[PDB]
Amino acid sequence: LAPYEIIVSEDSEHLGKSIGELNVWHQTGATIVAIEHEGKFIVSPGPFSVIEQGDHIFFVGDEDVYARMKTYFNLR
Amino acid sequence: GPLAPYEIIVSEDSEHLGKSIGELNVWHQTGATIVAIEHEGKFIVSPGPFSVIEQGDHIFFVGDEDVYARMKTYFNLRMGL
Ligand SMILES: Nc1ncnc2c1ncn2[C@@H]1O[C@@H]2COP(=O)(O)O[C@H]3[C@@H](O)[C@H](n4cnc5c(N)ncnc54)O[C@@H]3COP(=O)(O)O[C@H]2[C@H]1O
């Protein structure tokens, strides 16, 4: 149940959007447990939390979900 | 730490049992983000809206102490308090 962490530092059409707007679980299979933004954490973020460039996304899933999240945010 | 999941065993009768996470709309009801369900000793991680919560399952979720209190009340686990 340990979360993966990615840093969304690359340009992506998925930045500047809320978790619900992206519909993250349906896009990547990931359940986001926290967002780190400017060194501050929001746990259990809900659909209205926004993912901005440079933020850290903590999420649960398997290795395939990790791969989907990386590709989805242009981290390849 | 703060991202460590809470664990509740939904052992009491509840109108919410036999429903999917999406039907319950869990995050909007309790503030909790469910990370896994344990059912018959088997774990589903990142369960999504179609996973069903059945009596006796263990629900693992992130939140704070207040979210825990909401989940416990929501699933009829208050033990008379
Ligand atoms: N693991 C879970 N724990 C707690 N509740 C859960 C849940 N999975 C689903 N739900 C609840 O069911 C609703 C629909 O979930 P769905 O995954 O289809 O649709 C979700 C999902 O695609 C996405 N989403 C929201 N929060 C997410 C998160 N932390 N991680 C990944 N995707 C999320 O935005 C959509 C709307 O989310 P919203 O919270 O308004 O509504 C969610 C939520 O109330």
Numbering used by the authors:
A (entry chain B): 135 to 210
B (entry chain A): 133 to 213
Please quote the authors directly.
BusR is a member of a yet structurally uncharacterized subfamily of the GntR family of transcription factors that downregulates transcription of the genes for the BusA (OpuA) glycine-betaine transporter upon c-di-AMP binding. BusR satisfies the overall domain architecture of the GntR family with its N-terminal winged helix-turn-helix motif (wHTH) and a C-terminal effector binding motif, an RCK_C domain (regulator of K+ conductance). Our structural data, supported by biochemical and biophysical data, reveal that BusR utilizes a unique domain assembly with a tetrameric coiled-coil in between the binding platforms, serving as a molecular ruler to specifically recognize a 22 bp separated bipartite binding motif. Binding of c-di-AMP to BusR induces a shift in equilibrium from an inactivated towards an activated state that allows BusR to bind the target DNA, leading to transcriptional repression.
We purified and crystallized a construct comprising only the RCK_C domain (Leu135 to end) and solved its ligand-free and c-di-AMP bound structure to 1 and 1.2 Å resolution, respectively. The crystal of the RCK_C domain in the c-di-AMP bound state contains the physiological dimer in the asymmetric unit with one moiety of c-di-AMP bound. The c-di-AMP binding pocket is localized in the cleft between αR1 of the two RCK_C subunits in a conserved hydrophobic and narrow pocket formed by residues Ile153, Gly154, Val158, Ala164, Thr165, Ile166, Pro181 and the main chain of Trp159 and Gly180. The adenine base, especially its amino group forms hydrogen bonds to the peptide backbone of Ile166 while Ala164 at the same time prevents a larger group at C2 of the adenine base, thus preventing c-di-GMP from binding. The 2′-OH group of the ribose is coordinated via a hydrogen bond by Asp157 and the phosphate group forms a hydrogen bond with His160. The individual monomers are identical and the resulting assembly is symmetric, therefore all protein-ligand interactions are mirrored on the opposite site of c-di-AMP. The apo and c-di-AMP bound crystal structure of the RCK_C domain show that c-di-AMP binding induces a subtle rotation of the RCK_C domains that results in a widening of the binding pocket. This movement pushes residues Pro179, Gly180, Pro181 and Phe182 (chain A) further out in respect to Trp159 (chain B) of the opposing chain.
